[PDB]
């Protein structure tokens, strides 16, 4: 369970290194949309929510926005692409604090391919 | 009855070695989708649930998502492909703990073919 790291400017911009054998923790709050951006050239195939009515999903290209639609919206999200599948544990917060506006992935698998 | 093994990072990512003469134990929890991924180049033919209304099934290519739809969703799943058939014993949990996000198969039959 990997917890994304914040930027030095604002805590709402968070970074995580991709790991195929781990799940990414996403804290969702009321009235906040989170922007998850895929890797360049990566093609969306399918996604699945553990609870579809808990969250809203919108995608255009490699840009994904999620947003809670219900109370106690605690579920998981799996997005499968041409190159990988992303595992997110979506956990709604109570105090509307510590929101996440974007999640950006650092891919060391492509770095190893380059190596 | 083979119990999949977890990864060293998160317990939600589990691995099992395929055996044509054994059944794979899948623990399903409330509000969690499980991603089962078939072998590359493997063609889906048919699946069968012992109880279709207990689980939701979605497939695109070699990616399968299952998700309980009902209380006490204890059944079995058989997926038949060109090369093999998979046997899953789907057992819903009570405490919403120890979820499985992905199940990945290690195939020693193809390894023996390579040998």
């Amino acid at each position: 369970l990997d917890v994304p790291s914040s930027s030095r400017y604002d805590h709402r911009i968070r970074y995580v290194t991709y790991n195929p054998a781990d799940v990414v923790q996403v804290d969702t709050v009321l009235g906040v949309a989170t922007h998850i951006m895929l890797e360049e050239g990566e093609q969306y195939l399918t996604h699945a929510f553990g609870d579809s009515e808990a969250y809203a999903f919108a995608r255009k290209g490699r840009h994904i926005f999620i947003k809670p639609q219900a109370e106690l919206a605690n579920t998981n999200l799996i997005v499968v692409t041409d190159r990988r599948s992303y595992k997110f544990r979506l956990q709604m917060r109570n105090d509307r604090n510590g929101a996440m506006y974007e999640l950006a992935f650092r891919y060391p698998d492509t770095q190893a391919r380059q190596t | 009855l083979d119990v999949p093994s977890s990864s060293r990072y998160d317990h939600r990512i589990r691995y099992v070695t395929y055996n044509p003469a054994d059944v794979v134990q899948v623990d399903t929890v409330l509000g969690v989708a499980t991603h089962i991924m078939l072998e590359e180049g493997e063609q889906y033919l048919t699946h069968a649930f012992g109880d279709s209304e207990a689980y939701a099934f979605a497939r695109k290519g070699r990616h399968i998502f299952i998700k309980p739809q009902a209380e006490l969703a204890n059944t079995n799943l058989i997926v038949v492909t060109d090369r093999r058939s998979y046997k899953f014993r789907l057992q819903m949990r009570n405490d919403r703990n120890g979820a499985m996000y992905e199940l990945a198969f290690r195939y020693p039959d193809t390894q023996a073919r390579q040998t």
Binding site: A48, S52, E53, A54, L72, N74 | -
Partner: peptide, 19 residues
Amino acid sequence: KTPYELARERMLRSGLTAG
């Protein structure tokens, strides 16, 4: 009635993709 129960009913009810 309690919001945990409504959440659990929602989780059972929903599909994998909204549509």
